[PDB]
């Protein structure tokens with residue numbers, strides 16, 4: 001904890017409200033790419049579970065030209081998440097021949113956008129034929145909205161399978177778990193970043209799981225930001241932690257179906273917080289879960305776990321897994 005990132009993050013938001021007003025302060029999250037440009041007068045927001053691509057501007061002077069350029073930028077940007085500050089209005093020149101959204105959003109024509117020529121056209125279509133308006137209360141906000149292909153999620157999840165597969169055998173963790181979580185945590189968003197700076201596809205925070213993992217493997221110190229914005233490594237690492245919550249921390253839990261529930265919950269709020277729903281004594285806790293049927297452990301973790309986020313998440317990961325279980 002020697003960051004000082006907090007000071008920038010705090011003035012990013014305020015830079016926003018200075019222009020957008022407190023009510024219109026939208027910002028990057030796990031399931032939402034959001035990038036300001038044009039001195040914070042322009043927003044490119046990808047929503048990875050809706051999954052829409054609203055581009056808005058509030059510049060007074062030439063709204064279209066401002067919008068235009070965001071559309072082309074969002075549609076063509078290559079998925080280099082490491083070269084990308086989702087907290088500056090600085091230009092992350094990430095134009096690639098291999099767009100991150102290629103396969104995930106289409107022309108009005110119905111084709112994939114790959115080069116500036118179609119990107120320009122999809123843009124120009126939308127500015128002449130899909131433009132919209134709302135108000136701050138103060139200024140008009142001009143908006144374009146783009147829906148992504150209906151299976152954008154499993155089209156996005158496809159990038160990370162080779163990674164999930166490798167990490168699943170290395171550590172012993174079911175890919176289904178890895179995907180369920182990865183899905184639930186980021187909707188497969190490589191740009192994913194939390195308010196509590198959990199990072200990347202598996203929403204991993206450097207100074208808890210990232211430390212403990214690095215502490216296995218035999219690595220003094222702590223995972224780099226770039227490191228977690230490598231899908232290959234973030235998936236390595238979230239998985240490594242899943243292994244860990246199961247071998248050590250929640251390994252005193254007898255029943256493996258019960259243990260998984262603990263693991264999942266724990267993956268989101270810590271093993272200490274899981275065990276602490278039964279006893280403040282980590283042994284007594286394990287003893288009590290072994291008193292139970294995996295369904296009552298589920299129904300406990302789902303009803304009595306202190307975090308709202310963590311109760312609503314078990315059903316999310318447990319449910320996503322059922323889908324991923326079969327091949």
Ligand SMILES: CO[C@@H]1O[C@H](CO)[C@@H](O[C@@H]2O[C@H](CO)[C@@H](O[C@@H]3O[C@H](CO)[C@@H](O[C@@H]4O[C@H](CO)[C@@H](O)[C@H](O)[C@H]4NC(C)=O)[C@H](O[C@H](C)C(N)=O)[C@H]3NC(C)=O)[C@H](O)[C@H]2NC(C)=O)[C@H](O[C@H](C)C(N)=O)[C@H]1NC(C)=O
Pocket residue numbers: 030185194195196197198202203204205207208209210211212238241249266267268269270271272273274
């Ligand atoms: C929405 O996305 C966010 O998700 C990630 C998961 O995706 C959330 O991050 C999880 O947050 C947990 C903190 O809430 C964190 O667990 C804490 O983990 C550490 C590390 O293992 C535990 O401390 C270790 O504890 C053992 C003792 O059991 C000691 O041996 C170790 O030495 C400790 N090691 C280190 C390095 O500290 C900590 O538990 C201990 C025991 C404790 N009682 O303090 C554990 N927390 C709790 C309550 O038990 C997870 O590590 C992390 N998961 C991942 C993958 O990173 C994130 O949560 C935030 C930060 C939150 N809950 O507010 C999610 N949410 C947001 C909003 O961003």
